[PDB]
């Protein structure tokens, strides 16, 4: 049965690719030659955030657009006040190998996880003054590689078990399981309407998952190496992904297509963290080569060089109001840029 | 910051920074050490010797007023490619090899080759621990499994002149031990660049002075790292 099944699956993927090619008629770059490029943007280090002992592996922005939480493997989740550079919280962890953090949209909770195999959710607004462990979600065989809140009582995680889990904070057990990835998933990003999310694994293929029904809605391929970073386009029907092959690229949900690849010859180290601006015109992408490039999402050109980090850039994210972008690197220093 | 609310927020941030300075003093005086191996290698008995689906089995042991951290990865899959760069600033990586199996020895050798040549794991020295030397000695003296059944190069092998055995021991056991050590040494010296070094050791589960060996190897590693940093090596 295996012999016929493999050939029929290969034929099915061939016909899927044939339909993909049929739907592909004119590329976005040649459509966007007519419109005027943004040109060159001078983004400067508006703020530098200091206090992390070891390198920073994750960061997230609040819906309030002011506070941001950053995780370091020295066992600290530092919640800052971005404008005043002040530290709002310094949460000590029970396992100092955190690579994930998710500031809740309501701001009440903060997630973390990593090699500890457990996603720790911490509450911030309590009768007593301290940030205690709200819950400890266990059930991932592999290391937690990304985590993102939906609301105060739900969170979606992507772990090293090549699987994602839709959790429930109240009960403490998994609600839905997302499987189908060969390699271990390293990052997921949520849609603005919070109905579907894109997760990128090391099988050089991202997947669009529906949170409610819990099945793999749409598989996207086209990368040569491990996918490290994922961000979802603000429109709600596209998303950018960044791999170790120093090339990031944009995919569209409805089109089911590999759009332009923001690749350049001088850059050879892969992308680690990727994000969009508020309008989606700009695409920021940190690199293993000390750099955080900014691409015009419709021109595929490096619209400005945004160096300033003395080590690997491992974190990124654009404030929900679009005012500024925070970049966390391995120099143990956050940097807020505008 | 002129407002009293902002002044008190800045003062709270200063208190948090003081706590972070205390944590920095604690963390900077502690040496981080990765522990790698395989099934039945002997990592578990080693980590219990100095003393669910959990991922990091943190261990802390103190030698000569120096704190060392064992980071054992458990209940995790193979293909240790994407979590291995987290241990980028660790003092060293202790690699545990069961030298008695002779059938998983090739897999352990390949794992050591992968770890030594890892692009992220450069600048990081490897402390090699060969375990179950009593079991290896019993197996080699019993003659149940010859070395040539798995390793054909044992025939054309000579014990090095600088190979000191235990005071009372069969020299075939010593030859096998030093051949197994020289395999990992050859892997380490094939492409080492003189920036990270391997420290093979012969030890058993009941050998209680494994923390002292880790201490000495880490002392040598940090000393050589500082000598290279100061251009003295």
């Amino acid at each position, epitope marked *: 049965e295996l012999d016929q099944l493999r050939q029929e699956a290969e034929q099915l993927k061939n016909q899927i690719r044939d339909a993909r090619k049929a739907c592909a008629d004119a590329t976005l770059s040649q459509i966007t030659n007519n419109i005027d490029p943004v040109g060159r943007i001078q983004m400067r280090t508006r703020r530098t955030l200091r206090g992390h002992l070891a390198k920073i592996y994750a960061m997230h922005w609040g819906t309030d657009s002011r506070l941001l939480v950053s995780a370091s493997q020295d066992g600290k989740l530092i919640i800052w006040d971005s404008y005043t550079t002040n530290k709002v919280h310094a949460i000590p962890l029970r396992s100092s190998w955190v690579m994930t953090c998710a500031y809740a949209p309501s701001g009440n909770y903060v997630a973390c996880g990593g090699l500890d195999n457990i996603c720790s959710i911490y509450n911030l607004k309590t*009768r*007593e003054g301290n940030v205690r462990v709200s819950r400890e979600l266990a059930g991932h065989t592999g290391y937690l590689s990304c985590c993102r809140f939906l609301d105060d009582n739900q969170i979606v995680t992507s772990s090293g078990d090549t699987t994602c889990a839709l959790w429930d904070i109240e009960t403490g057990q998994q609600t839905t399981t997302f499987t189908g990835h060969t390699g271990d998933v390293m990052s997921l990003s949520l849609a603005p309407d919070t109905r579907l999310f894109v997760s990128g694994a090391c099988d050089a293929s991202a997947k669009l998952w529906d949170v409610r029904e819990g099945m793999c809605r749409q598989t996207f391929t086209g990368h040569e190496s491990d996918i490290n970073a994922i961000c979802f386009f603000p429109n709600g029907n596209a998303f950018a992904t960044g791999s170790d092959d120093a090339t990031c690229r944009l995919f569209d949900l409805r089109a089911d297509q590999e759009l332009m690849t923001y690749s350049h010859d001088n850059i050879i180290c892969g992308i680690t963290s990727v994000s969009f601006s508020k309008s989606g015109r700009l695409l920021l992408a940190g690199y293993d080569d000390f750099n955080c490039n900014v691409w015009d999402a419709l021109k595929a050109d490096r619209a400005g060089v945004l160096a300033g980090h003395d080590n690997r850039v491992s974190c990124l994210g654009v404030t929900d109001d679009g005012m500024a972008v925070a970049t966390g690197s391995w120099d143990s220093f956050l940097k807020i840029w505008n | 910051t002129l407002s*009293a609310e902002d*002044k008190a927020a800045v003062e*709270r941030s200063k*208190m948090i920074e003081k706590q972070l300075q205390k944590d920095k003093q604690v963390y900077r005086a502690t040496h981080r050490l990765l522990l790698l191996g395989a099934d039945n290698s002997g990592k578990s008995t080693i980590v219990k010797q100095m003393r669910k689906t959990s991922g990091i089995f943190e261990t802390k042991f103190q030698v000569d007023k120096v704190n060392f951290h064992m980071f054992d990865v458990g209940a995790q899959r193979d293909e240790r490619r994407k979590w291995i760069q987290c241990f980028n600033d660790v003092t060293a990586i202790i690699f545990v090899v069961d030298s008695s199996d002779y059938n998983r020895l090739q897999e352990a050798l390949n794992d050591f080759k992968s770890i030594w040549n890892n692009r992220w794991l450069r600048t990081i020295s490897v402390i090699l621990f060969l375990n179950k030397q009593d079991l290896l000695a019993e197996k080699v003296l019993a003659g149940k499994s010859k070395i040539e059944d798995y390793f054909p190069e044992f025939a054309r092998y000579t014990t090095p002149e600088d190979a000191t055995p235990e005071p009372g021991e069969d020299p075939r056991v010593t030859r096998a031990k030093y051949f197994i050590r020289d395999e990992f040494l050859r892997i380490s010296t094939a492409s080492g660049d003189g920036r990270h070094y391997c420290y093979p050791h012969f030890t058993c589960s009941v050998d209680t002075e494994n923390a002292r060996r880790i201490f000495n190897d880490c002392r040598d590693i940090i000393q050589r790292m500082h000598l290279r940093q100061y251009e003295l090596l």
Partner: single-chain antibody
Amino acid sequence: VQLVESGGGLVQPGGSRKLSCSASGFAFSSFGMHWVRQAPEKGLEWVAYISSGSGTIYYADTVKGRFTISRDDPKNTLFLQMTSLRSEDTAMYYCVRSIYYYGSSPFDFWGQGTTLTVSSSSDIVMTQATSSVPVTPGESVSISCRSSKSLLHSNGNTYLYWFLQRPGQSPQLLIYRMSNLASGVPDRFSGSGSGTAFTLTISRLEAEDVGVYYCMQHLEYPLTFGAGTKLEL
């Protein structure tokens, strides 16, 4: 979360006494604490403040060196050393917890209060327009507060606090900065002010709204209170 105070009693004028407030159920090492006091026939008044780590400590105009404040983090208590007790120093003192990070709610929970009976400009003079008004339940209730200086800061925060203590029990916290509503208080309360005059509205009134409503400024730091509008049913 219980703020139990101990002490009180009849004290001869000019004497010295230590008023204590024991804190349980919450770690206030990150809390700045206020010793707000209630005169027998007047409104609330603030005398002193000790920070979380005691780095910044401020007193009031009427009591600068005559009072002394201490906190014992291991013992989890506040100590108030008061000296030269005049006829004015009669009040049911309240120990007040207030964490001072962004988005916090200072003055949220207050101590039980112990009565103290004895025998025989830069200050923001902010006054409430009225002092007593009987209003029927259900329909909207408007309470007016006015300040002698603009309370809006350059950072976009206009500090304001409303308490509405129920008769014969410790004041609670209704609204802070007239834009954010506390967890314990129901959502029916609201506030609005330009920066000099402020108003508080209640959607529906019940037996819990009986009492006198208070008004605090925090831009400058005399911590001057309002006269207080007494709501009687």
